[PDB]
Amino acid sequence: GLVPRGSHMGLESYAFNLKQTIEDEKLKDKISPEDKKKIEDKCDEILKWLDSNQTAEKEEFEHQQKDLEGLANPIISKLYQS
């Protein structure tokens, strides 16, 4: 073990959604295009990895997650200034 699919969809999904969110007309403008790029770049990256991999041993699949969590959460925290 060696990640099973669930987790694989889970990351793809997170990654995917951060993206949607960042480019959602209703939010698009409340996020500095620096942070916007940073998110787009980590997301795009991870998705590519996920794509090449759909399994690779977890003890690091996590690295790839936490890497992106580390970016997003702080950014999108500030973002929920609705």
From Swiss-Prot:
Q: How is it modified after translation?
A: AMPylated by fic-1.
- Tell me what organism the protein belongs to: Caenorhabditis elegans
- The protein's name: Heat shock protein hsp-1
Q: Indicate the quaternary assembly.
A: Interacts with E3 ubiquitin-protein ligase chn-1.
Induction of its expression: Induced by white light exposure.
Similarity section: Belongs to the heat shock protein 70 family.
- Relative to the complete UniProt sequence, the shown stretch is 542 to 614 of 640
